[PDB]
Subunit: 176 residues, 6 copies
């Protein structure tokens, strides 16, 4: 109510709007316009957002952690409440270490929905206070992925519409 | 700053699944409206009045939620209410496909409206308003899936 | 002890697809009942009596199979017939979510009831009572899909 | 070969390209830009295409057969190899009556895929010489349907982008 | 007829999900074999001998259930064991396409082997060895997932 | 007027299902190229040379089909070959989501290329290269699913 600190610290649920801090994990190898759109839309409705970049994915990425983090930072510089960071644990454990209460997930295809539901159940088991929030990609970006853009780019297809200029130039550099 | 979210549905009637969604949503957004469809395609068991009153009581305890009836284009309602976020729960794959389509259409009608999706708790993952009805309409226990005010009103409808 | 299984549906009329499902169940379970819903959601083409009759003839050659009607929750008719098993035909991924819903609810209702899911034969994987009738209603050929008693009945119905 | 008619009329498989005539069945209540895209693409790759309009859909249509047929005729009259007709039969029977050998189906959502496959098995059983061919909608028209356009229009939403002018007028007139 | 069933998988390790599935299979068929794949595609955390041991202990309370290894076509092992039933536990929609494939192919390889699908308990429907392991490769209580012996064994394996 | 279509794939090896698709496609389009991917991400069992050779013999009977290796962007290949139609077979729901994504991308890369989709025959609806290889590898009879030339070459590979 006012000086209620002496009586209670406060619960998360049932009591109105709490501070929100979101993580948006992925490999971002490299960040595409689809990613930027998602994080832009998240940053608009949550207090803070961390773009969390997986340091050691399963498949060796085309860009190293240091390149991924630098490229996303530049592309996201225009969002004042977004911070880019690397991580190397369960998104849940990083989330806890970061005191995040929102996990952002992009929801691109029907194929993924079953996996996303399962991951979310597991994440609720791991970190009950972590709420997963799902955003569909803009129509513009619904078919693109980092994977697809790299493979089109390797064979010289035009991918300028899908990447920020800083990433597109880095990408060309990687491909000779 | 300010977030104002609409959670639309038919809520005929509101279940524990809905309450879970709206509770979670109302922890993340400054205000939430449960927007109850006036004139659903399939004529419902409870009318708007009944639905709105049951929901109002079921969510009375949440400080920052309001229950209202609407009967126009969600774009115009959200705009009327100056809401920037549309909340939908996603139970099943079938429902995602259809919600994705509506999201695209709403992006066209109202570019400044953000659609956002939540998944049910595992506890409520199988319930729906339709299922609770059909079970109770053949005397199955549904007391676990509904608030008392709603259970009673349902029992009352089936007598 | 024993296993007693229920294969519910409207069977309006029964097709070689159903007859396959029940033949396979009847080979792995001591008794099986073909439970023909009396009051389906839409009005049937054949009334329960015609249906129960047609199914009875069609399945005469199966020793441990009984054809009955039922108008209530499956968990009730199961209880009533002292059945421990529920047979569900499982054709498409598009059915699987809905079937998994009903399975959770029937466990909630009747936790001693087991839902068992059989895939139809590739031969019958695209047919249904509905499609068979729609096709027949415009004089398409459906002789491959129905036993003769049913095929004769249907022809007579469409005059 | 030369004049092998005395010897054979020829069979459809194993012997190069044959004349193609497609039917594109639906209720088209009313025809949208999505429909127009499908059939335009069809008409560019097959010799003739018939837009087949279901006389008696299961749900009562907003436009009657006569009105549906007229609206489509107009929307499609710039395609020289397209004809619009009503029909009240199995698509397979109409195609037989019409001596069609291709059935066009639009393929918009995951949810329909298995239904479509099942319909294609039925139609193969009914008319072996009928081939089903599946086209996806343009990104541009991926979300629209007649149903959704009608319900948006009923509530005064702007649907001018999804319909040809003749249809958009007919529609406002129904909903006055 | 007499009913003997095969329940194949890697079971690396077994979980309460499997145990639930095999229990339910067990309770409708005379005998059930938990058929453990010897050489799975990726190398397992537990070797065949450990896996069989963990399983045997876990299911020891089920009289009519026997664990075994197998390193061939499922259809052949089934023919060898004179099994007339194959047990698949259907969790997700995604897997159902792939399981429908295998079932058609097994019908081709072994026409006398009937495929039977059981859906998991709501409780267990998200759990999967691979998940558990990858959780346990970091942290988080899995006591409710695994049986005691498996729990302990896994704990040991960690470091 | 004239139509020229590409059917791209890995065809490692070509099966009866692929032959069915291309036969059907070559009856509706003037010319068809079977385009065989030179460098698949996964290393194939048969190299490009063997894959093209087997495919060439398998489709030798079809007057208006040519089998070619490619190792570039389909858009440039189709452009190189002056092809205006891309043919993909569509077996499963999984395949459809992915195929729809590439079709959008291809429409961005090559607006004048029309993507077209065919369902397998019921006969071949469950087969794939991967599955036939896996059955063969454990001695399963797969003679019904491949041409003689291809069968012989597979048996050779697996010795």
């Amino acid at each position: 109510g006012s000086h209620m600190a002496s009586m209670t610290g406060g619960q998360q649920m049932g009591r109105g709007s709490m501070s929100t801090k979101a993580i948006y994990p992925g490999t971002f190898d490299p960040i595409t316009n689809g990613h930027i759109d998602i994080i832009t839309r998240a940053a608009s409705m949550f207090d803070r957002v961390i773009l969390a970049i997986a340091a050691s994915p399963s498949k060796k990425p085309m860009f190293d952690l240091e390149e991924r983090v630098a490229l996303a930072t530049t592309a996201l510089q225009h969002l004042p409440n977004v911070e880019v960071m690397g991580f190397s644990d369960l998104m849940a454990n990083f989330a806890r270490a970061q005191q995040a209460n929102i996990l952002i997930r992009g929801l691109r295809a029907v194929a993924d929905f079953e996996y996303e539901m399962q991951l979310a159940h597991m994440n609720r088991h791991l970190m009950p206070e972590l709420e997963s929030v799902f955003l569909m990609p803009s129509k513009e970006w619904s078919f693109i992925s980092s994977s697809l853009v790299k493979e089109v780019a390797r064979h010289a297809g035009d991918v300028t519409h899908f990447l920020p200029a800083n990433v597109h130039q880095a990408l060309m550099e990687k491909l000779k």
